Write a protein that binds this ligand. Sequence first.
Ligand SMILES: Cn1cnc2c(N)nc(N)nc21
Length: 167
Amino acid sequence: VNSFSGYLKLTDNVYIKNADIVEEAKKVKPTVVVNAANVYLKHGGGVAGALNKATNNAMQVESDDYIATNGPLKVGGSCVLSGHNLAKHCLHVVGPNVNKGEDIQLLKSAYENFNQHEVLLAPLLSAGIFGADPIHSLRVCVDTVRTNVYLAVFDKNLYDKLVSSFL
Ligand SMILES: Cn1cnc2c(N)nc(N)nc21
C-alpha cells in the first residue's frame, strides 16, 4: 500500500491523475518526483520551472553545482538530486525536445530511467513545451516502465483525452 490517492489505474503498474505536480508532491512527499529536465538543468518553465519555483530556487542552485562538476546530461539520460521540500529525491530526466529537433526514439531511453526506482511521481515525458504528442508519451511510458509510476496531468482537458483514448 502507498499514499497516492485518486488515481485511475491504467495497467498493472501505471496510474494517472489530473494533478499539478507541485501540489501532489507537497501532499505525498514521495520518495521520487521526476522532473522534465533539459541537459543543462536550466529549470525555466514547464514542470522544471514549477518544481524549481516551489523549492524557492534551491533546485536550480543544486543543479548549477551539478553541471559545473559533471557537465550536461545526455538527451534520454538522468541524474538523481535532492527532492528538497517536495520529495526525498528528484530524478531529473531529459526527454527529447521536439521544438529543438531531437529524435523522438530517445523517449523510450528517457523512460527507461524510471525502472531504477520502485515508485515514482512523474509527468509525461517530452509533452507540453517539449513538443511531443502526450498520447504517444503515455503509450511509451506504459510499454517501457515496469516500476510503479503515478502520472500527474495538469490540464483537465488533456487528462480526459489520455484516458478516453487509452488502449
Ligand atoms: C506539463 N506541466 C507543466 N506544468 C505542470 C505542472 N505544474 N504539473 C504537471 N503535472 N504537469 C505540468
